[PDB]
Design an enzyme around this catalytic site. Structure first.
Site, mmCIF file in Angstrom:
data_model
loop_
_atom_site.group_PDB
_atom_site.id
_atom_site.type_symbol
_atom_site.label_atom_id
_atom_site.label_comp_id
_atom_site.label_asym_id
_atom_site.label_seq_id
_atom_site.Cartn_x
_atom_site.Cartn_y
_atom_site.Cartn_z
ATOM 1 N N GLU A 23 43.824 42.168 50.218
ATOM 2 C CA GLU A 23 44.824 43.248 50.211
ATOM 3 C C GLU A 23 44.836 43.925 51.577
ATOM 4 O O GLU A 23 43.845 44.543 51.991
ATOM 5 C CB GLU A 23 44.520 44.322 49.148
ATOM 6 C CG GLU A 23 45.548 45.472 49.187
ATOM 7 C CD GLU A 23 45.303 46.575 48.156
ATOM 8 O OE1 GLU A 23 44.218 46.602 47.480
ATOM 9 O OE2 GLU A 23 46.191 47.480 47.969
ATOM 10 N N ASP A 42 39.959 43.994 47.163
ATOM 11 C CA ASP A 42 40.630 45.279 47.166
ATOM 12 C C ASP A 42 40.506 46.060 48.470
ATOM 13 O O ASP A 42 39.408 46.464 48.867
ATOM 14 C CB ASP A 42 40.152 46.126 45.993
ATOM 15 C CG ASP A 42 40.882 47.430 45.893
ATOM 16 O OD1 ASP A 42 42.101 47.420 45.717
ATOM 17 O OD2 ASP A 42 40.231 48.468 45.990
#
Ligand SMILES: *[C@@H]1O[C@H](CO)[C@@H](O[C@@H]2O[C@H](CO)[C@@H](O)[C@H](O)[C@H]2NC(C)=O)[C@H](O)[C@H]1NC(C)=O
Ligand SMILES: *[C@@H]1O[C@H](CO)[C@@H](O[C@@H]2O[C@H](CO)[C@@H](O)[C@H](O)[C@H]2NC(C)=O)[C@H](O)[C@H]1NC(C)=O
Ligand SMILES: *[C@@H]1O[C@H](CO)[C@@H](O[C@@H]2O[C@H](CO)[C@@H](O)[C@H](O)[C@H]2NC(C)=O)[C@H](O)[C@H]1NC(C)=O
Ligand SMILES: *[C@@H]1O[C@H](CO)[C@@H](O[C@@H]2O[C@H](CO)[C@@H](O)[C@H](O)[C@H]2NC(C)=O)[C@H](O)[C@H]1NC(C)=O
Ligand SMILES: [Ca+2]
Ligand SMILES: [Ca+2]
Ligand SMILES: [Cl-]
Ligand SMILES: [Cl-]
Lengths: 198, 471, 198, 471
Positions: free
Chosen positions: D222, D185
């Site tokens: 990401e 993330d």
């Protein structure tokens, strides 16, 4: 739409586009053909100016001044021309020193030309002023040597209400002749432009 | 078609701008040949206009093809091909075949010229033979520059059979007389379409001069193309060499101080220049040596100019041509004159210079010394590059030769040469005379690694050494 | 030198530079972040504007207006900023909707900031006006929602007499946040600029 | 490190956004496995904040690593890995390891969270463990976005040994439980420098699940990078795959009508996308499916969306991931709720859809039919391209498979497939059931050359056929 304007008391390559033998001296002057003959050079303001608006049909009335000093070193075909060249079918006011004519050459077909003599300006500064009224459709050019006060002017009705024109790239196109018409130079040291819509 | 054509073991050509024929001959065998020279781009040999004041430019208005010029009639010409060609000095005629004249009637060999009525009897040539009148407006319109009158000069139509016929006869006539090439005058103003058909009737070289059986005539063309224009030099590539005009500007700007010499590493195609074997490179040129401030280097500004042609010469790209101009103070002033005549250019005494108005660039130590340098390295790709990442450059053409230079910073380096360990007589400053060096006697250890020293204040910024300078 | 100016009642990609998620809708509005989050988009007028003159030391007083409509679709870090980004060390007026501050961020160090609330403008049109006097060295910003008449202003002395600045590229830089601060959009539909020297 | 890791003969993964654990299990063995599916990017499994209204975004504020989520506690998780992994459905955890929370104290597994004092006892975690406070100013300043608080979210310092230690324990813990990868993330907000050291402590996969001995964990990250910013996706390439974000925009714009499908011929690296085997491509994504007007295609605009993921699927580039979102009307509205709980997503009756608020994109004919298409063509380079030079495209992955489509212009063409002569049951519209086609039963002559007919008004713009559809 976009109305644009600028004043350049001293040129700088930074906001300019240089094709062919086009440069900028330390003294801040744009220079074309200084190292060439039988060829064409050009310089254009970075920003692509807008002439016609597709959202109304409207057209920009542009106005513009610029001092220039044409030399031949000899005591269009050969000369310096202001051009509205479209974006990568050209309205062009040409100061042809060879045919000794000032004209509004649109698509190789001069809409109006008038004689002028290069020797009335070779060596010194000349004030040119182009202007186009969107309302009256009147184009107009004026050459004048401040040192004495000679002015070879000209004027004509030009219609730019043609869908193909929208965005142009205002600049200069100094062309250079062959043999003895190989030495002409083209200095431009001041230039101001201005488009407008209503 | 794009082959040099020089007598083997020799390299590059010279522009003896305006020189007389018999004079050329002397130069051909007395100086050109002894020095590994390619040949000569012989000034316009055909009858042209007698323009008042008799300026260099008059030489570009064909009145006719009658071979009698200010450099001499056929007798001397024929002779000039016979001496000069035997010496190995190839002759390259300036072929002005796009127009005739723009003014009236005085032909250098008594032939008239009725500009107004479009008449050239010497030929003959009349209105039908010319394109329709109009003039050079926009260099943005392709047929306009090609099909109209470049500077009110009567534009011939190379599209007609009669006209193609005449031009062809002219060139071949020259091919008969000996020439191997043609510096096509203003190719940009002619349709390449028939420019080829004309470049075809040209029959293979005259066997009887020395040429390798069935060898075609070297054809290089004049096309100024520094972008923007609707015309491209590449349009005249599929059938002949073109005169690279960016070469002069860029490399000229470079040495003028307008660019870091360090940038010339990728010197070549990566600068908007065609394939090496496609161009005839040159620094200044008879015409553009008249322009002046900036980019172009003429003998007027010597030092960087020599380093320039040196970089040319040394470097492999295209085929080269040095220029031997004559001193000038106007832009239209004719070569040496006297109530009608070209004064000879004796080179005298002998530091091997020239007198009475002719500069003779080619006879300059720095320039000629480097030509032989060129010969000496043939077949060698670019190798052993070096720089001070500013205005000091150096490299070498294989074990055959080496060079270096500097605009700023005493290159007192300790470099390589990648050659046989030994000593070498620099050619710029010096050469080898009577088995001893006349300028710099440097050493080179057992593996290329040599020490160099070229100071700012020196006469020049360049040092060449090659096996054909090994003592 | 070069004094430049322009009025854009309706944007057109033609005279614009688009980095990141920057575009132009048929309705003539510049749009940033409309398809992105946790990233930065930018748009700049083609012509590289000149701020400092090296031939005198002089500096351009620029003045500029622009309407914009910031949305969040939720009933700098996240926002829209006007920037004078140099030519390929940045004066930046940022409308950070996340820290809820308007500031003149010069080299990551805000010279002056003031609080403003996004909900006083989210959804409608906002008039921004940046102005810098070369003579008094006074920078100034003003936000105002015409629909009601709320104006979060600010002002400070900024010195741009630094040799490193000469030519800048006036534009917009709309940055987009993460997670729930991922949906903010940035519409700009009017923009006028103006540099000046004396 | 960048290896997919799926059970052989299978291809690509799904994002069962917010779905429950035991629910996943059902789906894993009942629908995913029978359909040649890669696996599942499992929604955030670790204890996160209980944000009022319980929005999808709450799921991104780590309170702790305690494996008890709204999708279930460890028991169900462990179970979910054991059923799902045996089915071949690889699980891919969303690893939120850059921050904790920005608001106060309610942890989904009773753990508190003192935002103000920077305290997370569940861990434990205190001030020393965090970077110094500051926030995300300029995405033009590299350490600012990495080292400050992304959206007032307490930025952990992945530079410390303690912090690296904890994260490492978390991931490995998961690796122990079975997972093969991690959808890191917000990599853009973390120094790649220690992002690697953390990606190293990760010990090879748990042998006992089926993994090829010593196989490392698939790591995809990401990183939104559509140019301009001081951060680049390539900075996170030397040690893991990244989520190509231009893919969605460009290809999305393409099918949205914002670009000629004819332009996708050079679809690939030539669009500002890294090497094929470096990316995890996807159309919409849990986050950016919230943006809306323009470029991004979500199920909200079905037709071109399917053609889109189809082009993805069919095309070879990177590794793919379909998304199974849940219907939404706000931008913060939580998945199915009732006084605290996630409502199951039975798919019922059976056209194989889903009910009570879950869209189940993956169970759509067009989408899944194409996944197996993908499996069916593996190892095949791009071949037999075609277009109407507008919005009609077609090609095929070797003798293994073929596809075509159109935004405008009834592709009633007469093309090729470059496959065995035969007949094939299209998969978009139809498939083969009980040895007969349920939609389009086309013919293909003795050498690829087949006839196609896909009309504008049709349900979709796409037609797939492959040997694993040959009847
Ligand atoms: C035109 O502006 C350019 C760009 O600012 C000037 O170029 C710079 O000159 C300054 C001052 O000497 C140097 O510090 C920079 O290194 C230069 N930058 C570049 C990109 O060249 C230039 O001096 C200006 N020219 C004129 C005639 O004023
Ligand atoms: C070009 O110069 C002309 C002539 O000076 C400008 O026209 C004048 O602007 C002056 C100064 O503001 C006024 O006093 C005059 O009333 C204007 N008209 C005339 C006929 O002199 C014009 O503004 C200039 N155009 C641009 C684009 O710079
Ligand atoms: C912005 O101006 C551009 C360029 O003129 C417009 O694009 C053109 O639209 C015209 C009219 O429909 C077409 O004839 C041309 O083919 C288009 N050219 C290009 C390069 O796209 C565009 O319509 C303008 N946009 C707005 C919002 O006014
Ligand atoms: C931006 O808009 C401001 C405010 O309207 C302009 O400032 C005014 O211009 C108007 C119209 O000519 C004048 O009536 C006022 O006297 C000006 N000043 C004020 C304080 O209102 C300004 O010209 C605009 N700037 C640009 C670059 O477009
Ligand atoms: Ca011609
Ligand atoms: Ca961080
Ligand atoms: Cl020449
Ligand atoms: Cl994702």
């Amino acid at each position: 739409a976009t109305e644009t304007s600028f004043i350049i008391d001293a040129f700088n390559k930074t906001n300019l586009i240089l094709q062919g033998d086009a440069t900028v001296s330390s003294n801040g002057n744009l220079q074309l053909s200084y190292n060439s003959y039988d060829s064409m050079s050009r310089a254009f303001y970075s920003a692509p100016i807008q002439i016609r608006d597709s959202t109304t049909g409207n057209v920009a009335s542009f106005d513009t001044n610029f001092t220039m000093n044409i030399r031949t070193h000899r005591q269009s075909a050969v000369g310096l021309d202001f051009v509205l060249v479209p974006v990568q079918d050209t309205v062009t006011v040409e100061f042809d020193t060879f045919l000794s004519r000032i004209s509004i050459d649109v698509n190789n077909n001069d809409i109006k030309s008038v004689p002028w003599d290069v020797h009335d300006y070779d060596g010194q500064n000349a004030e040119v002023r182009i202007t186009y009224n969107s309302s009256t459709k009147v184009f107009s050019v004026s050459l004048s040597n401040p040192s004495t006060g000679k002015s070879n002017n000209v004027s004509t009705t030009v219609e730019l209400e043609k869908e193909v024109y929208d965005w142009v790239s205002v600049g200069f196109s100094a062309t250079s002749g062959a043999y003895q018409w190989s030495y002409e130079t083209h200095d431009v040291l001041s230039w101001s432009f201005s488009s407008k819509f209503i | 078609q794009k082959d040099a054509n020089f007598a083997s073991g020799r390299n590059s050509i010279v522009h003896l701008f305006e020189w007389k024929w018999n004079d050329i001959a002397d130069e051909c065998e007395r100086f050109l040949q002894p020095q590994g020279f390619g040949g000569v781009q012989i000034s316009p040999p055909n009858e042209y206009l007698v323009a008042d004041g008799r300026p260099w430019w008059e030489r570009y208005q064909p009145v006719s093809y009658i071979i009698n010029t200010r450099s001499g009639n056929e007798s001397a010409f024929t002779d000039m091909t016979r001496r000069c060609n035997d010496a190995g000095v190839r002759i390259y005629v300036d072929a002005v075949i796009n127009h005739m004249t723009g003014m009236n009637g005085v032909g250098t060999s008594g032939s008239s010229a009725d500009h107004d009525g479009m008449n050239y009897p010497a030929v003959p040539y009349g209105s039908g033979d010319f394109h329709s009148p109009c003039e050079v407006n926009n260099y943005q319109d392709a047929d306009n520059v090609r099909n109209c009158e470049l500077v009110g000069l009567r534009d011939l139509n190379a599209g007609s059979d009669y006209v193609r016929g005449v031009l062809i006869d002219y060139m071949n006539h020259m091919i008969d007389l000996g020439v191997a090439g043609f510096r096509v005058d203003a190719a940009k103003h002619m349709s390449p379409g028939d420019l080829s058909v004309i470049f075809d009737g040209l029959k293979n070289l005259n066997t009887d001069y020395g040429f390798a059986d069935g060898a075609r005539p070297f054809i290089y063309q004049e096309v100024i193309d520094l972008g923007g224009e609707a015309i491209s030099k590449n349009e005249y590539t599929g059938f002949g060499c073109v005169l690279e005009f960016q070469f002069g500007v860029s490399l000229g700007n470079a040495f003028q101080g307008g660019n870091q010499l360090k940038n010339l590493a990728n010197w070549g195609p990566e600068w908007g220049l065609l394939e090496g074997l496609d161009a005839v490179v040159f620094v200044d040129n008879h015409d553009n040596q008249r322009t002046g401030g900036s980019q172009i280097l003429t003998y007027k500004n010597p030092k960087p100019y020599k380093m320039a042609i040196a970089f040319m010469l040394a470097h492999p790209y295209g085929t080269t041509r040095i220029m031997s101009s004559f001193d000038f103070t106007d832009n239209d002033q004719g070569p040496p004159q006297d109530g009608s005549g070209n004064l000879i250019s004796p080179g005298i005494n002998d530091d091997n210079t020239c007198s009475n108005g002719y500069v003779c660039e080619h006879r300059w130590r720095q320039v000629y010394g480097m030509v032989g340098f060129r010969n000496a390295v043939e077949g060698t790709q670019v190798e052993n590059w070096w720089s001070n990442d500013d205005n000091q450059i150096a490299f070498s053409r294989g074990s055959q030769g080496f060079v270096a230079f500097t605009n700023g910073g005493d290159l007192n380096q300790n470099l390589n040469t990648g050659l046989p360990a030994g000593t070498y007589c620099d050619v710029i400053s010096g050469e080898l005379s009577g088995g001893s060096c006349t300028g710099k006697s440097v050493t080179v250890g057992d593996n290329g690694s040599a020490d160099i020293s070229l100071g700012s204040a020196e006469d020049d910024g360049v040092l060449a050494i090659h096996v054909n300078a090994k003592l």
